[PDB]
Amino acid sequence: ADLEDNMETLNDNLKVIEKADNAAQVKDALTKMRAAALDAQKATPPKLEDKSPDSPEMWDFRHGFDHLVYHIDDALKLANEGKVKEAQAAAEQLKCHCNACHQKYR
Ligand code: HEC
Numbered sequence: 500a501d502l503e504d505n506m507e508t509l510n511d512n513l514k515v516i517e518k519a520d521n522a523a524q525v526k527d528a529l530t531k532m533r534a535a536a537l538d539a540q541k542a543t544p545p546k547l548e549d550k551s552p553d554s555p556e557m558w559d560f561r562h563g564f565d566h567l568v569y570h571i572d573d574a575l576k577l578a579n580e581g582k583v584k585e586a587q588a589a590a591e592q593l594k595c596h597c598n599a600c601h602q603k604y605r
């Protein structure tokens with residue numbers, strides 16, 4: 500999948516999480532989001548296409564996904580413990596990090 504597919508996967512599963520009826524449903528969407536984040540971490544966003552692959556911008560882009568995954572992994576901990584509401588609030592914490600990378604690189 501390309502970066503656009505990964506973003507729609509992140510967007511769709513965040514909506515799945517918000518509408519979920521139990522924590523296993525949240526757990527399942529979070530794992531799909533984890534996969535999509537690591538995949539997206541390997542892409543070059545179009546705005547940075549003529550930057551060096553070693554550029555500070557490209558490393559900042561990749562590191563935004565590391566922090567997103569960290570957050571996804573914390574939400575997964577709550578989902579595995581059966582705490583549906585806390586895991587959902589944990590998933591909402593992702594949104595500002597989605598937004599901060601978009602502001603720089605969308
Ligand atoms: C950088 C570390 C990002 C993080 C974290 C998130 N997104 Fe993102 N997103 C990013 C880029 C560079 C782009 C442009 C994609 C392109 O190919 O030009 C996007 C785009 C989106 C979109 C629009 C996709 C499209 O059809 O063009 C969506 C819906 C989207 N992003 C959602 C999204 C969500 C929900 C995130 C947090 C879970 C998130 N993104 C994080 C870069 C980054």
Ligand SMILES: [V+3]
Pocket residue numbers: 566570596
């Ligand atoms: V954070």
